Ligand binder design. Structure first.
Ligand SMILES: *[C@@H]1O[C@H](CO)[C@@H](O[C@@H]2O[C@H](CO)[C@@H](O)[C@H](O)[C@H]2NC(C)=O)[C@H](O)[C@H]1NC(C)=O
Ligand SMILES: *[C@@H]1O[C@H](CO)[C@@H](O)[C@H](O)[C@H]1NC(C)=O
Ligand SMILES: *[C@@H]1O[C@H](CO)[C@@H](O)[C@H](O)[C@H]1NC(C)=O
Ligand SMILES: *[C@@H]1O[C@H](CO)[C@@H](O)[C@H](O)[C@H]1NC(C)=O
Ligand SMILES: *[C@@H]1O[C@H](CO)[C@@H](O)[C@H](O)[C@H]1NC(C)=O
Ligand SMILES: *[C@@H]1O[C@H](CO)[C@@H](O)[C@H](O)[C@H]1NC(C)=O
Ligand SMILES: *[C@@H]1O[C@H](CO)[C@@H](O)[C@H](O)[C@H]1NC(C)=O
Ligand SMILES: *[C@@H]1O[C@H](CO)[C@@H](O)[C@H](O)[C@H]1NC(C)=O
Ligand SMILES: *[C@@H]1O[C@H](CO)[C@@H](O)[C@H](O)[C@H]1NC(C)=O
Ligand SMILES: *[C@@H]1O[C@H](CO)[C@@H](O)[C@H](O)[C@H]1NC(C)=O
Lengths: 171, 114, 214, 49, 19
């Protein structure tokens, strides 16, 4: 707030400031533009999924353990333990200055993240290109192995070792 | 206690109704009065039906013209879609569709000199 | 339907009208800032010179010069910022043109949503409009699947596609379009025994050469 | 878009090694990507023609 | 069903072998 910051309660100061012109219009316009830009960035980043997908109750995906990345209802906010650690490790009107809140709350961002996770683990890469085709996760892994130039048998013959290594990597 | 006031408006094209948002103010110290994390909202009723965000207020709340009055609501991220997962079943597309998406990008400004 | 989408929605080209509106607003405010007195006795150098003598008018002229210099400096700073932004936008537009019009990009969501097929550029007053022709699956159906087939004590994997079943029968089909084919040696390859693979099923893998060779 | 909603052939855009998949994670002011990738080992020597 | 289809000999390598 130009008045509060520059002058405060001084009416003669406000009268003197009115002589300078339209500096404060530009200032407020730029600040509101920055705010809308941050909001648009958050939206474009976290709202890429079309619909909020769900996860099956049976949390079994052929030995792959996603408990460290999937949301945990055992706490108030539906956030994974990794997300909880990330949030805990990051620490977070005064004479004119104010801080407006974001449009998407932390809970909504977490819901978008959970939807993206469910889609990725339940329908492969298809949910990002059309209807979310339900596909088994070992077959998704075979698809991606073929994608990196490795045949599917290389997976299907080591599935157990691969899943164990993946769990250890998440840990 | 002080804070900026914003005017929620559906546009003079539609109606002259307006709702005022006192940013960060707790209206316990200054027809429907509704308190939100972004401030206090006067002139808009809180509807419990979730809709797409028309006018963003803040903290997950938006406003829009009901059609009749200005309603405030918690924005919906999207419709729930449960995927039937199974380690022995698949979904395969028996069809396809060709679509044409329109995209726009600016490339240049107005060359100016003073 | 592209033309209908462009006609019904008036705000479809807002991302392109915004830059013109911003330039117009910048020029308008830079023109209007001339009426500012900047603390001087008047905003018109003609009157400042006519009323006062040079000795005492020099301070007022210096005040106005300082004010206008600062205003123009702020204007050119904002102009440089917006020019950097539009330079980034133009770089993105050139990358999109190169990777969508001159060819097909495996990028999943660069040239529009869905599986990209091709693109068409269209001119604009101050930008470019891309018509991204894409491929989107539709009308899907459920099927039973197995990662391999156990035949003659050997495991069979598909060369391209996946094994599918509609009950009492098995077929091979490409993942992006349903086209059931008989499981034969031409569309499958053997690798080791069928005891190590998890979830393997048993089905007849017809040899395409055995009937003719017999 | 590239890593989560698909599989990129870009050799260094979704983490080191051959990229398989990635999982996004929210943050108070950003996003944390967990790039699951493939890395070989035990490079045995062989004679080729 | 295909438009613009033409005719030509498609040899099968199994015939000359006669296995
Ligand atoms: C794939 O989809 C297309 C269109 O969605 C189907 O084409 C339709 O076929 C029916 C009956 O054959 C016609 O009555 C419609 O007029 C067709 N649509 C159009 C736009 O021409 C096509 O049959 C589908 N393919 C399969 C295998 O189901
Ligand atoms: C996944 O790992 C966590 C932590 O080690 C463990 O508590 C959980 O039981 C594991 N998942 C399963 C299905 O065992
Ligand atoms: C008034 O015009 C605006 C601008 O396009 C539009 O968004 C709105 O729907 C219009 N309202 C009516 C009642 O026509
Ligand atoms: C507003 O004040 C009331 C009464 O002290 C309190 O219960 C409420 O939590 C306050 N809300 C905000 C957003 O400050
Ligand atoms: C929404 O629910 C609250 C809580 O019950 C209630 O006070 C309010 O009247 C409801 N809104 C409408 C439009 O009914
Ligand atoms: C597959 O079956 C489920 C019920 O188990 C159903 O909801 C779903 O729509 C089916 N898939 C398709 C593509 O119809
Ligand atoms: C499965 O599909 C095949 C397609 O050739 C068909 O011949 C067969 O009758 C189908 N079986 C059932 C049980 O629907
Ligand atoms: C598929 O999942 C079910 C339930 O989790 C399990 O009983 C079954 O053994 C699984 N199939 C295989 C091949 O592991
Ligand atoms: C392959 O040969 C090189 C050169 O003799 C040697 O340094 C390397 O260790 C060999 N590979 C392995 C896996 O030992
Ligand atoms: C190919 O041969 C078929 C029958 O032998 C005939 O009907 C068709 O017209 C021929 N097409 C061409 C291009 O020769």
């Amino acid at each position: 707030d130009c008045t509060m910051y520059i002058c405060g309660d001084s009416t003669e100061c406000s009268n003197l400031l009115l002589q300078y012109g339209s500096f404060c219009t530009q200032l407020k316009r730029a600040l509101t533009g920055i705010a809308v830009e941050q909001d648009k960035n958050t939206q474009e980043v976290f709202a890429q999924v079309k619909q909020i997908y769900k996860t099956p109750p049976i949390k079994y995906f052929g030995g792959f353990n996603f408990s460290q990345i999937l949301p945990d209802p055992s706490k108030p906010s539906k956030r994974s333990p990794i997300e909880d650690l990330l949030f805990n490790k990051v620490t977070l009107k005064f004479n004119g200055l104010t801080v407006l809140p974001p449009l998407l709350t932390d809970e909504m961002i977490a819901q978008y993240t959970s939807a993206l996770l469910a889609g990725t683990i339940t329908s492969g890469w298809t949910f990002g290109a059309g209807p979310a085709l339900q596909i088994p996760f070992p077959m998704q892994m075979a698809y991606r192995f073929n994608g990196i130039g490795v045949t599917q048998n290389v997976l299907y013959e080591n599935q157990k070792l691969i899943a164990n290594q993946f769990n250890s990597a998440i840990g | 206690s002080f804070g900026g006031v914003s005017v929620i408006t559906p546009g003079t094209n539609t109606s002259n109704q307006v709702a005022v948002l006192y940013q960060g103010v707790n209206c316990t110290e200054v027809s429907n009065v509704f308190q939100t994390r972004a401030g206090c909202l006067i002139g808009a009723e809180y509807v419990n039906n979730s809709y797409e965000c028309d006018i963003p207020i803040g903290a997950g709340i938006c406003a829009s013209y009901q059609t009749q009055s200005i309603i405030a609501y918690t924005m919906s991220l999207g419709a729930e879609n449960s995927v039937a997962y199974s380690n022995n079943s698949i979904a395969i597309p028996t069809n396809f569709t060709i679509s044409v998406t329109t995209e726009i990008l600016p490339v240049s400004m107005t060359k100016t000199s003073v | 339907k592209i033309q209908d989408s462009l006609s019904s929605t008036p705000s479809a080209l807002g991302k392109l009208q915004d830059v013109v509106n911003h330039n117009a607003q910048a020029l308008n405010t830079l023109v209007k800032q001339l009426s500012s007195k900047f603390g001087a006795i008047s905003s018109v150098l003609n009157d400042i010179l006519s009323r006062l003598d040079p000795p005492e008018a020099e301070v007022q002229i210096d005040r106005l010069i300082t004010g206008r210099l600062q205003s123009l400096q702020t204007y050119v700073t904002q102009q440089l910022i917006r020019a950097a932004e539009i330079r980034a936008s133009a770089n993105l537009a050139a990358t999109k043109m190169s990777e969508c019009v001159l060819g097909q990009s495996k990028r999943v969501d660069f040239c529009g949503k869905g599986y990209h097929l091709m693109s068409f550029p269209q001119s604009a007053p101050h930008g470019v409009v891309f018509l991204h022709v894409t491929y989107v699956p539709a009308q899907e159906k459920n099927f039973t699947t197995a990662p391999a087939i156990c035949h003659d004590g050997k495991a069979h994997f598909p060369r391209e596609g996946v094994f599918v079943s509609n009950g009492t029968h098995w077929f091979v089909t490409q993942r992006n379009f349903y086209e059931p084919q008989i499981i034969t040696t031409d569309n499958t390859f053997v690798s080791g025994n069928c005891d190590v693979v998890i979830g393997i099923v048993n089905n007849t893998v017809y040899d395409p050469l055995q009937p003719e060779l017999d």
